[PDB]
Design a protein around this nucleic acid. Structure first.
Ligand code: CL
Ligand code: CL
Ligand code: CL
Ligand code: MG
Ligand code: MG
Ligand code: MG
Ligand code: MG
Ligand code: MG
Ligand code: MG
Ligand code: MG
Ligand code: MG
Ligand code: MG
Ligand code: MG
Ligand code: MG
Ligand code: MG
Ligand code: MG
Ligand code: NA
Ligand code: NA
Ligand code: NA
Ligand code: NA
Ligand code: NA
Ligand code: NA
Ligand code: NA
Ligand code: NA
Ligand code: NA
Ligand code: NA
Ligand code: NA
Ligand code: NA
Ligand code: NA
Ligand code: NA
Ligand code: NA
Ligand code: NA
Ligand code: NA
Ligand code: NA
Ligand code: NA
Ligand code: NA
Lengths: 119, 145, 115, 246
RNA sequence: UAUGCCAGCUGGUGGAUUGCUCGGCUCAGGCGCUGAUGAAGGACGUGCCAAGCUGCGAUAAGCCAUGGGGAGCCGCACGGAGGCGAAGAACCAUGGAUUUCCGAAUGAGAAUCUCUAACAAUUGCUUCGCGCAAUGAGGAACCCCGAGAACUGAAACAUCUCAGUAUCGGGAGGAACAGAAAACGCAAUGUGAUGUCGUUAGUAACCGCGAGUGAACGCGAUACAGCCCAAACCGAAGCCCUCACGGGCAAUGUGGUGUCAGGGCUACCUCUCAUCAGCCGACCGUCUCGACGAAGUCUCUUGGAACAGAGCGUGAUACAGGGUGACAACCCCGUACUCGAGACCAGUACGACGUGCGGUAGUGCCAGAGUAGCGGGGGUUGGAUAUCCCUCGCGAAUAACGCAGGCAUCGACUGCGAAGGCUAAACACAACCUGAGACCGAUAGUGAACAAGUAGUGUGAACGAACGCUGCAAAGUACCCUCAGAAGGGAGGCGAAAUAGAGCAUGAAAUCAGUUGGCGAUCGAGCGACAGGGCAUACAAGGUCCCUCGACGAAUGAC
RNA sequence: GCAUGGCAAGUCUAACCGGAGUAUCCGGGGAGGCACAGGGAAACCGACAUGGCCGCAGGGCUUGCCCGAGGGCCGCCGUC
């Protein structure tokens, strides 16, 4: 499908497991070197650095990852509500870079390390 | 710019009164209607004439004029030369789906020619002999009597 | 409204010559050439053989086709020639582009117009 | 004429005779006609629904209610062309023939002529191509066909001082208009045509605006994209010899 | 100067315009049946809270297995509460479980419920018992067999035409149908099953000989494929059901042989590589799906945001397309390359097992009847005498015979065996999958981008809309004053922007409020064109114009 | 009909086939069509590559006089 309508359609309608790819980000130099991948599906454990938004430059821990909306929550990247409350400002993993990994999962780390699969 | 292109604005599009380009009445009838009444003009007259013979009782002859043969004798280098001698059958195209080959005598014959075909016309003969040549009637040509 | 850029130049050149040089044939041809393709000449050898004469360049303001026989040793000048024509012609004479004629004879002298 | 062959380093390596075809008079008018035909021939048939706007029993009340004689239903006008939701008077039709016929002779003549235009440094410079060379078309050793890396064709192109033309086509144009919505958002200048002999250069193809072709089937389009003659071409020692018989 | 006219300014109304695209439209490749094992469809249920939609079915947005997938998840749907997931959930693929009621609907009745074991009805086999089975209904069109108009054309109209069209009845399949000559008849020393495609040809033929209608042989292609009975001669050597026993069928003939390279019989020659039956069983290709997948997120400037400008650098068998706060090969998805899986091709091709092909001589043993053929009446066709068919009546030969070759009869010549049967592939459609576009871009394109066959209308058959757009992010407006007030208003907050504040991008015209300029309560109506005056006017995008005098000075031309 | 363009006594391929960059495109394919002869219901027969005269353009000459395609007027030829 070279057609814009179908392209957008397939992204917006991809089943749950096919959304993981929409929450991927580039990996710092060290990390690409260490595992042999250019980017990784951000996990709520990883640390990351904002490279584009108004929060570009800031670094923080990934607090949440939504697959439906293809967005993430990074600690301290927030907005001032009217009532004074502070809420997270959603980000696109495309403007983010993972500087640290949470590898408490054998499986993820298993995937990361192997050279025939990517995490 | 085309004629059609310029019609926007003319209203009528070159039909005169807007009361014109309606139905077939503006044509005097649908199809060839009136070919015998109002528009009999320029319509071949009515009736039947003659007859036809069954398609498969009809013989179609493949014809050629001396002039054609003669104008290219030299060029037909791939054809006998003698005291030229050409079998027409090999010359004429369509000489397969034809019931036979016939030489016609139109034009001139500037060479001495030996012609072999299934049938010739007086003129073709006279002309071909008149140039010190001969006409040879094929075995199929053996149908003269 | 001629489409051919070549036929278009030839005509231009034919004009340039007719004016400068004293020619009248060139301007004449220029005009025929500007006329509708259908009006241009299509002449077979059979005709050229019939009305041409040695040392008098035949000018065909059209194309020459190879039907018939040409024996005379004449110089024919046309817009173009069927391969057959230019072949039969060079066998007893010489086939020449009008562009070349304009150059070897800008006064358009001793020329015969055939159509 | 003479043709300067080049080795994969960009250094002269003998020379061959530029086949006759490259001497055919340039007829951009016939070329254009053949490119036009090619482009129409790949256009797809389309047409609105035969029944679009006719799906209803609407009827006209005629005279009597101070209303115009227009077919209506549930008090809403329908079917007629001047009525919203009505049929399209004269719509696009599947049935229409959108193809173009072109005499083989007329077409083949256009190919040779496009070929010829390739050998004119002036035409190629006018068509728009960027390069600092004097001879054209660029002819190269058959070893070109073994290249595998794009990057290598680049050095070879920079060595032949022809790489500036890819620099030219290394810019995209986001068109004006709705083509966008139909997957035609972009468009880019046509650069160099590489014509090999056994197969189309897999090493060159991805080059910015480059098109690859084979000597036996290269056409009037690759030879003169858009009907414009004079494309900066680079043949292969063998290609150049095959082309000659086209 | 009230009422008011013309133009504009600010705000509104309205939703055009431009941009955008989750939908349409069209083309193409692939694929293609479901159902008594109860389908399609409908009804009613099913969620913590649940109205609509979607799923599902009392195990009810689900249960189980295997693989994949992965750190998240609890449908569309972003609330509140609560829960599930490393015991590997979500999600995806395959397979399995459950699967109410009505429905072909089948125990009987019934507007989805009820009454007291059920294949109801019609059939086949039959242990003659519903014991074993079949049918029935659906499906986008496509296919086959039957029934069959009229408007219309003929410038009226009857034959003719529209047209075997619309529409109706019966039904098949993934394709149908056709099909191995009682053919063709470029008449031949020739061709060799059938569809379909191109051509033959708008030819031959028909026709108030008007209007119109309209093939075939052949030829070039696609794909290819050729067989089985009946009988003669044999005469139970046979078949079905059952694990078996046993039962059933069959002399009104199961079975062998045989099928125009005619066959059988008798005597011979030679041989099998035909055919038929059963076994094995793909490659490749094509469609779809999946794995992996190179290279910048560096500097300065603008900006809310760099995907912009300038500079520096990189990949490319990958510069298709998309996403991402603006124009991105190198930020992410993907794309090229390579690889894997499923489906179709196909239970086909190939291979193998069994069978045995063929030839000579003799033999009038066999070879499909209301048929071939004729006649009466219709229909249909290009079919004219010479299309194909129906109906009523009549009616033959037996291969030593019979039919055909575009009128009949007789003879000759040439072709060919009807009145039994089957048959792969090439062709149609587009439900389903995928892909494509000089198509439309929300009054368009489907009726339907939205709750769409929805709301709504009609007793019913049926009819049938309108409605897309906040923002980068909800940051979806805290607190205070006012108010009957979760209304509204004021002040205030967010944001680049609230004149982006909820049907929220832009925001036209008609038109409305307020207001500015001009006119105005003694005056006349196509509302203006061209001249010439008043009053009015920030810049910008136009910079000319006024008076004395003088130069030039056509026609005309004085006191 | 016409303007333009290709080829020319010829011209064009159709379905279809192979190739490929796979609807484009390159090659092949001339079945067949129209043109190359007509006349006649049919049987059947079967024509001027030019014999004469005017003469436009154009050319030539010693400057009206020649040669004069095309064009025009006749002859002659095929067939009913
Ligand atoms: Cl006849
Ligand atoms: Cl001629
Ligand atoms: Cl035949
Ligand atoms: Mg890995
Ligand atoms: Mg032929
Ligand atoms: Mg519409
Ligand atoms: Mg526009
Ligand atoms: Mg019941
Ligand atoms: Mg009528
Ligand atoms: Mg009449
Ligand atoms: Mg009819
Ligand atoms: Mg026939
Ligand atoms: Mg048997
Ligand atoms: Mg009829
Ligand atoms: Mg609509
Ligand atoms: Mg708005
Ligand atoms: Na007119
Ligand atoms: Na009119
Ligand atoms: Na008429
Ligand atoms: Na409707
Ligand atoms: Na009205
Ligand atoms: Na079409
Ligand atoms: Na299917
Ligand atoms: Na609900
Ligand atoms: Na189920
Ligand atoms: Na049953
Ligand atoms: Na029973
Ligand atoms: Na009428
Ligand atoms: Na009437
Ligand atoms: Na009639
Ligand atoms: Na033939
Ligand atoms: Na991004
Ligand atoms: Na009868
Ligand atoms: Na026959
Ligand atoms: Na709308
Ligand atoms: Na032919």
């Amino acid at each position: 499908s070279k057609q814009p309508d179908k392209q957008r359609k397939s992204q917006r309608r991809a089943p749950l497991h096919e959304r993981h790819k929409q929450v991927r980000a580039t990996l710092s130099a060290d990390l690409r070197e260490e595992y042999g991948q250019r980017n990784v599906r951000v996990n709520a454990g990883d640390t990351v650095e904002v490279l584009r938004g108004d929060f570009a430059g800031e670094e923080g821990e990934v607090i949440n990852v939504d697959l439906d909306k293809a967005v993430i929550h990074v600690e301290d990247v927030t907005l001032e509500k009217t009532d004074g409350e502070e809420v997270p400002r959603p980000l696109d993993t495309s403007n983010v870079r993972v500087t640290d990994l949470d590898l408490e999962d054998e499986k993820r780390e298993a995937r990361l390390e192997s050279e025939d699969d990517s995490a | 710019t085309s004629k059609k292109k310029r019609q926007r604005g003319s209203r009528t599009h070159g039909g005169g009164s807007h009361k014109n380009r309606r139905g077939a009445g503006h044509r005097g009838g649908r199809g060839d209607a009136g070919r015998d009444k109002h528009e009999f003009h320029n319509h071949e007259p009515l009736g039947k004439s003659g007859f036809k013979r069954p398609q498969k009782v009809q013989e179609e002859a493949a014809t050629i004029d001396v002039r054609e043969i003669d104008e290219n004798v030299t060029l037909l280098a791939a054809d006998d030369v003698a005291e030229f001698r050409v079998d027409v059958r090999d010359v004429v195209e369509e000489a397969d789906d034809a019931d036979y080959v016939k030489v016609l005598g139109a034009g001139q014959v500037r060479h001495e020619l030996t012609l072999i075909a299934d049938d010739f016309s007086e003129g073709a003969r006279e002309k071909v002999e008149g140039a010190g040549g001969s006409v040879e009637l094929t075995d199929l040509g053996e149908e003269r009597q | 409204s001629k489409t051919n850029p070549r036929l278009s130049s030839l005509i231009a050149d034919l004009k340039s010559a007719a004016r400068s040089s004293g020619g009248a044939v060139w301007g004449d041809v220029a005009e025929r050439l500007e006329k509708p393709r259908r009006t241009h000449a299509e002449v077979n050898l059979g005709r050229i053989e019939r009305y041409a004469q040695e040392d008098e360049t035949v000018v065909v303001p059209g194309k020459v086709l190879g039907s018939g026989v040409l024996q005379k040793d004449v110089t024919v000048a046309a817009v173009d020639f069927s391969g057959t024509a230019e072949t039969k012609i060079d066998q007893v004479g010489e086939a020449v582009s009008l562009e070349q004629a304009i150059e070897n004879n800008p006064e358009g002298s001793h020329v015969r117009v055939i159509r | 004429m003479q043709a300067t062959i080049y080795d994969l380093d960009g250094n002269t390596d003998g020379e061959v005779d530029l086949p006759d075809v490259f001497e055919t008079p340039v007829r951009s008018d016939l070329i254009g006609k053949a490119v036009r035909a090619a482009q129409a021939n790949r256009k797809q048939d389309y047409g609105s629904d035969e029944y679009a706007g006719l799906r209803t029993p609407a009827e006209s009340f005629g005279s009597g209610r101070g209303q115009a004689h227009v077919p209506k239903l549930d008090g809403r006008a329908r079917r007629v062309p001047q009525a919203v939701k009505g049929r399209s008077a004269h719509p696009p039709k599947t049935e229409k023939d959108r193809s173009l016929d072109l005499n083989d002779k007329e077409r083949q003549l256009a190919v040779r002529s496009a070929l010829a235009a390739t050998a004119d440094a002036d035409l190629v410079a006018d068509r728009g191509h960027e390069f600092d060379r004097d001879e054209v078309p660029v002819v190269v050793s058959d070893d070109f066909e073994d290249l595998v890396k794009t990057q290598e064709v680049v050095s070879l192109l920079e060595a032949l001082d022809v790489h500036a033309d890819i620099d030219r086509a290394d810019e995209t144009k986001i068109k004006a208009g709705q083509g966008s919505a139909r997957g035609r958002k972009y468009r880019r200048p046509a650069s160099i045509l590489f014509v090999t002999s056994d197969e189309p250069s897999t090493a060159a193809r991805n080059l910015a605006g480059a098109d690859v072709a084979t000597a036996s089937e290269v056409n009037t389009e690759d030879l003169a994209p858009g009907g414009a003659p004079g494309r900066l071409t680079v043949f292969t020692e063998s290609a150049l010899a095959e082309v000659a018989e086209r």
